[PDB]
């Protein structure tokens, strides 16, 4: 900017999207990366392999396409996060992937958060990712019980668009069950 001596950051550091310190420490494993990234209305999970010109994505899963198998609920919560992670892991197994490491980017490693919930799903899917069980949320909160009891304090329905009043953490079980299913067009 100023002159010849000025030092301009790597593009992805200006944009503040990649923490290269945590990135290098991540690549050292030699294993692929289970990229867990959020969004306000969504949650995604990619599988990254190192490449000559840039990272290669061999498997992914967006919370949006989590509907193609029967999903009427929202797409930015705990149940959605676990499921999206489970989906990608299943597609991941398909390509040949058998192990990966958790990449959460700039998201905080907060106990029982959505990213660990995403991690849990891909592991449940058959993948081998170094984890720490107790840092994960409990099964009920993953299912969506924390939100079901929130809707208990009704007086005003939680969901705008029709789904149902008290909601259904069963829809979670119904979909999870559908993924473990041998058939299902991945």
């Amino acid at each position: 900017a100023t002159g010849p001596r000025y030092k301009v950051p790597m593009r992805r550091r200006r944009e503040a999207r990649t923490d290269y310190h945590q990135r290098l420490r991540l690549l050292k494993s030699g294993k692929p990366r289970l990229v867990a990234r959020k969004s306000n209305k969504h949650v995604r999970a990619q599988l990254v392999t190192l490449g000559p010109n840039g990272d290669d994505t061999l498997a992914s899963a967006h919370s949006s396409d989590l509907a193609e198998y029967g999903w009427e609920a929202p797409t930015g919560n705990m149940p959605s996060a676990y499921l999206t992670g489970l989906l990608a892991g299943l597609r991941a197994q398909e390509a040949g992937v058998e192990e990966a490491v958790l990449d959460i980017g700039l998201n905080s490693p907060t106990p029982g958060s959505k990213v660990f919930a995403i991690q849990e799903g891909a592991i449940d899917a058959g993948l081998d990712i170094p984890h720490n069980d107790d840092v994960l949320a409990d099964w009920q909160r993953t299912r969506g019980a924390h939100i079901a009891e929130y809707d208990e304090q009704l007086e005003e329905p939680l969901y705008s668009g029709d789904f149902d009043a008290a909601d259904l953490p069963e829809h979670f079980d119904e979909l999870r069950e559908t993924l473990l299913d041998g058939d299902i067009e991945l």
Partner: protein
């Protein structure tokens, strides 16, 4: 447009810089929340050698806690022209500072792909005065 541009009280800091404290309590009362210590840096010849040590205590009032506090705090002070910062901020007086800003300030306060607010979307001293004056008081 006017909607995603109409300013608001982001935070209201109220602190009492001492130099050696016990005064914390008065704020915890008038504000309605908990205060926090205030350290320091560099050795000072006015018996202030201990670098990290309790000198004052501030309180960051946001949302309602701030407004309800301003209903009384504002009248207690005569506002002036020169009392305004270029980014539409003012301090008066015990001290009271109001940090004002336009709707999407989370863009510069978040962790993921944060960005600095463009000079255009940056609040103006004049545009700030008008906003405040538009709420039970005068100006210069």
């Amino acid at each position: 447009f006017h909607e995603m541009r109409e300013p608001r009280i982001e935070k209201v800091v109220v602190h009492m810089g001492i130099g050696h404290a016990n005064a914390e309590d008065i704020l915890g009362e008038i504000t309605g929340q908990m205060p926090v210590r205030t350290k320091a840096k560099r050795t000072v010849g006015e018996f202030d050698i201990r670098e990290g040590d309790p000198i004052g205590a501030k309180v960051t009032l946001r949302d309602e806690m701030a407004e309800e506090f301003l209903q009384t705090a504002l009248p207690l002070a005569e506002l002036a022209t020169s009392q305004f910062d270029d980014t539409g901020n003012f301090s008066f007086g015990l001290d009271v500072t109001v940090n004002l800003v336009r709707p999407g300030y989370r863009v510069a306060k978040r962790d993921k792909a944060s960005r600095s607010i463009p000079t255009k979307h940056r609040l103006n001293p004049a545009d700030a005065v008008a906003f405040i004056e538009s709420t039970y008081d005068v100006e210069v």
